[PDB]
């Protein structure tokens, strides 16, 4: 969860 991407997207 560090940016708009990814699994959990930052913010999730």
């Not at 969860?1 to 999730?12: C, I, T």
């Amino acid at each position: 969860r560090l940016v708009p991407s990814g699994p959990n997207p930052l913010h999730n």
